[PDB]
Structure 1
Amino acid sequence: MTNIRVAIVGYGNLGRSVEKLIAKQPDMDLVGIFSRRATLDTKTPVFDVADVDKHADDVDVLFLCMGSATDIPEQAPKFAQFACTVDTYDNHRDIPRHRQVMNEAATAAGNVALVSTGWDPGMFSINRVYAAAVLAEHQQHTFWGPGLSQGHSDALRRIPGVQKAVQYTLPSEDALEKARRGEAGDLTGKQTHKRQCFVVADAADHERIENDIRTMPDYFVGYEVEVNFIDEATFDSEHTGMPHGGHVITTGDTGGFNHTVEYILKLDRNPDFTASSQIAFGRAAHRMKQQGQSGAFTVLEVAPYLLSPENLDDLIARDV
């Protein structure tokens, strides 16, 4: 009767965080990890991503943890055919297309696919919509960092020549304070964030790599970008942590009265929080299937209570 049979697809940072965190769940059993690699450092059973079809009946929801920049678009739709799915796809300009192709696959299989979960997209997306809906007349801005962005970091490593790479998003603190006072209108995220890259690569490949970085669509174009090529020794010791966070600020006026809505996240480890978010929506995905639903849904489409491990009545009697 109880217990969601879960499985991870892609054993990177995010993949390792969801494996770790499934242990804190009272209703989930990790059945295994589907990977492109043969030897993983874990006691959890490893399967070939190609043998997913063979495990279709013993898995309720697959947690997609492959790279957004190149893996998700091509691979994601494939898995929706075998079980419910949850991803953290973050290329915003590509979300409507992704939602459509995942809906096709999920609807045909009778499954539920929760797309673009996490904190951004994910929690920040939900907040943007709530604050904007409530405050008719409003101004809204999202700030990231300072911290390590997993999507931009992975995008850098797919560039040939890049041995090791990491990217930090640096927000304009000046603009963040202006937002709080409702005086940052017309200012965009591309204008309030700097992107600094720390890359380890052969000197000969520098020019090319730098070109591919500054011209990469969505992740980098239109942003101020600093590229640093550093010694591998310095990399392995200075760039090991994965902190991050952000602020979604919304101000509104009701006729001579201002209101400020602020959602803040201070994450010690980006992979871990993202993984916690993904797991919660994994629970909702499954519950939605149990109730007769199918297709791809964004975070804006699931009622909040579906994420909780506790039943509705307990939440209504304690948290409302």
Structure 2
Amino acid sequence: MTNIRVAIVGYGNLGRSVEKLIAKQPDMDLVGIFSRRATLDTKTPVFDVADVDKHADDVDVLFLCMGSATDIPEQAPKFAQFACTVDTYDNHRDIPRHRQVMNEAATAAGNVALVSTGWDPGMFSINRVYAAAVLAEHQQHTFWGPGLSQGHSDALRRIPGVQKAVQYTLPSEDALEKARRGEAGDLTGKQTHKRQCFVVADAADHERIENDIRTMPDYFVGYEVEVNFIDEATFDSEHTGMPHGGHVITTGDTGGFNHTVEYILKLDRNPDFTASSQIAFGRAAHRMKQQGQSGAFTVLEVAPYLLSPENLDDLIARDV
């Protein structure tokens, strides 16, 4: 009855999303939260992150939901000392090193570390690899969105006189249809997406701002940008969500015959879906260590059935 004993390290949006979804898992028990703050908006027990050493045996897997930017790279390796570990670290350029270092740690403690799960990296990585592997010579693209970009939203905000603001990254529909036909080979980043800004600001300032936006080097110049100055009420009512999604499109030619494989995600709420993967890869981590494996692995190294709470035979009988 496994009830694989889990805990959460870090209590932000993600951390909250994991907490809430564990109730819908048949086989997991939440043993509590490890936090750097004493007092959280919650009934699950809270512990001091420094005291993780002491709880070592109440826990099977630790979901690491702290920051990618600086926390993960430094804190994560020590945690693999105490249990299996799953993270959603999204810095592509650092993955190889993160894994290498996560690898020396987990191996020495005999734990299993799953790194860089989520939707991208995660689901979209898997799909990229599958479709590219299949379609020998192939053309591949990843579009993001439609969804929230915190980095672009932050740039907007630093603008003088902007009160509240958000920017969405949308895929250029033209650009999708073209990739679908194997014709998007010579297209730049400025052509593949479009940006849609929603700004709350005094009417006196609209012209300067809109100008400040469309000329913003590196963040905004070069794109199709659409700008809306909205009431604070419509802002709060409609632009307080965290949606996102994307497309992985791969094409290949087999001698005069085209094939297109498209993977699409539509998420009403980013950290909820990200929690969903992370949780599924947590179950896989536990099963992997149960089979005597150890070290760090990416989502590319785990057989699919491992994420499932159903028994293999049942999966083979119904879904194959």
Q: Which category of TM-score, normalised to the shorter sequence, fits these structures?
A: 0.7 to 0.9
Runs of 4+ in 1 over 4 A off after TM superposition: 149-167, 188-191, 194-238
* Alpha-carbon RMSD: 4.3
1:290-320 deviation line (CA, Å, top 9, x unaligned): 0011111000000000000011111111111
Q: 1:221 to 1:102 in 2, by over 3 A?
A: farther
Q: Quick check: 2:197–2:227 contact (8 Å CA) kept in 1?
A: yes
C-alpha distance in 2 between matches for 1:216 and 1:150? 16
C-alpha distance in 2 between matches for 1:274 and 1:303? 19
Q: 1:95 to 1:186 in 2, by over 3 A?
A: farther
In the TM superposition, residue 166 of structure 1 has moved relative to its aligned partner by 5.7
1:47-84 deviation line (CA, Å, top 9, x unaligned): 11111111111110011111212221122112111111
Q: 1:5 to 1:258 in 2, by over 3 A?
A: same
C-alpha distance in 2 between matches for 1:204 and 1:78? 53
Judge which range, 202-211 or 264-273, deviates more. 202-211
Rg larger in 1 or in 2? Answer: 2
In the TM superposition, residue 170 of structure 1 has moved relative to its aligned partner by 2.6
Q: Quick check: 2:9–2:63 contact (8 Å CA) kept in 1?
A: yes
Q: 1:205 to 1:129 in 2, by over 3 A?
A: farther
1:260-303 deviation line (CA, Å, top 9, x unaligned): 10111111111111111100000000100000111110000000
Q: Quick check: 1:67–1:154 contact (8 Å CA) kept in 2?
A: no
1:176-219 deviation line (CA, Å, top 9, x unaligned): 11101110114355752356788999999999999999999999
Q: Quick check: 1:148–1:243 contact (8 Å CA) kept in 2?
A: yes
Q: Quick check: 2:175–2:191 contact (8 Å CA) kept in 1?
A: no
In the TM superposition, residue 167 of structure 1 has moved relative to its aligned partner by 5.3
Q: Quick check: 1:81–1:106 contact (8 Å CA) kept in 2?
A: yes
**What TM-score does the superposition give when structure 1 sets the normalisation length?**
0.84
Aligned residues: 320
1:99-144 deviation line (CA, Å, top 9, x unaligned): 1111111111111110110110000110011100010011110111
What secondary structure, in the 3-state scheme, does the structure 2 residue paired with 1:266 have? strand
Judge which range, 227-236 or 277-286, deviates more. 227-236
Q: Match of 1:277? A: 277
Judge which range, 114-123 or 63-72, deviates more. 63-72
Judge which range, 229-238 or 202-211, deviates more. 202-211
C-alpha distance in 2 between matches for 1:221 and 1:57? 54
In the TM superposition, residue 147 of structure 1 has moved relative to its aligned partner by 0.8
In the TM superposition, residue 169 of structure 1 has moved relative to its aligned partner by 2.5
For structure 2, the 5+ residue unaligned runs are none
For structure 1, the 5+ residue unaligned runs are none
Q: Quick check: 1:143–1:189 contact (8 Å CA) kept in 2?
A: no
Q: Quick check: 2:87–2:116 contact (8 Å CA) kept in 1?
A: yes
What secondary structure, in the 3-state scheme, does the structure 2 residue paired with 1:264 have? strand
C-alpha distance in 1 between matches for 2:154 and 2:116? 17
Q: Quick check: 1:67–1:151 contact (8 Å CA) kept in 2?
A: no
